[PDB]
Symmetry: C2
Subunit: 227 residues, 2 copies
């Protein structure tokens, strides 16, 4: 009867995609939160922060909510049939199937974005359409029981949205206040629409190799869904 919430924890995850939502959701009554990988034990994030998976795929209970974070490690997952099959297995009955940042590309590779409205990190957004999504430029996009969040820090806004769906608005407001989540960002560069052009150019320049490699992975993943 506790709400079962599971995050996929994988090598080279962008840890804040997971740890933001985790601290939001673990604050709720009558929840149990799982960090899932192929086996329990240490899993190193892209920053070198060490996290700890609490369960294997086999021991994970049926989930009410599955959440796929993003990060450098998603390219491997997009071509990992075990991970994709596990995600499909839990998605079907899960009440909610959510990702954050490039975690939606993993949902896409699993075939779970076909004909659905979805978002991802702004630098990767062109990869949603080949995976069958209708790409929406909004920070949290809901299509039925699919909730996708945009890039990294969007996980906090996504998790508060999810909290209200699982419980109610009052419960989400309580958590928002405990987290003192009234952001006053010291710059206005969080989107390509508002950042200085020089900043956008440098960020695009840095993401370019990753985007090309992910363009190739995405097109192999899509072809597998078609065949």
């Amino acid at each position: 009867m506790a709400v079962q919430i599971g995050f996929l924890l994988f090598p080279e995850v962008q840890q804040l995609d997971l740890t933001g939502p985790h601290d939001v959701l673990a604050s709720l009554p009558d929840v149990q939160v799982h960090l899932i990988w192929k086996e329990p034990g240490p899993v190193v994030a892209s920053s070198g922060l060490v996290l700890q998976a609490t369960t294997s795929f086999a021991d994970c209970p049926p989930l009410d909510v599955i959440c796929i974070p993003g990060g450098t490690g998603v390219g491997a997952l997009m071509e990992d049939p075990q991970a994709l099959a596990f995600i499909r297995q839990q998605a079907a009955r899960a009440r909610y199937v959510t990702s954050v940042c490039t975690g939606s590309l993993v949902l896409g590779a699993a075939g779970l974005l076909q004909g659905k409205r979805a978002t991802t990190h702004w630098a990767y957004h062109e990869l949603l359409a080949p995976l069958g999504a209708i790409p929406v430029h909004e920070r949290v996009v809901r299509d039925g029981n699919l909730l996708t969040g945009a890039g990294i820090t969007a996980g906090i806004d996504f998790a508060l949205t999810l909290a209200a769906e699982l419980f109610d608005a009052a419960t989400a407001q309580r958590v928002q206040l405990q987290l003192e989540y009234a952001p006053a960002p010291p710059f206005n560069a969080g989107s390509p629409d508002t950042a200085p052009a020089s900043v956008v150019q440098q960020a695009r320049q840095r993401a370019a190799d990753s985007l090309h490699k992910r363009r190739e992975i995405t097109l192999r993943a899509a072809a597998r869904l078609a065949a």
Copy 2:
């Protein structure tokens, strides 16, 4: 590299993990930083939510830090009376380029004597505990006094870390990180501050925190008495 900026977070039992992990991912995005997670010994440390983190170094083996950062959480009460942790913080604060904290981590800075006559904030529910530790209490989300930079409650760590990034490097660098992370929060409710949340919500929350506040007040006054002697 061997010339990296050395950034250290104190990692203690019953930490509020987001206070640490938010800033960590922002600062680890900067060029040629090394980040340490410091406790009495390396090994696992369990956050208040049950998330397990891993300390990378002991107090004794930690190199001199450019930045020290103290997170908050339920475990701060013990830290405020832990002579070994307080001595480590004071030693590192003697030479650090920035001494910071997030959430109730400033109460630990206060117990270490580092807030006396300095502007600072802390989690809104414990904010009246700054003044007995000698601080000038400021109701702002990131407060700066010289090389002391404190963040307010939990998620303020992200705003804090971007502010610190601009000081360590420059504004263009902190803007790039803000964009690479796509950090543009758009909360679905407006309850992040006691001034804006529905009154019933602020009242529920104060009802909840009261026991903790009365316990932390007594720890705070013991810590203050040790600074006065």
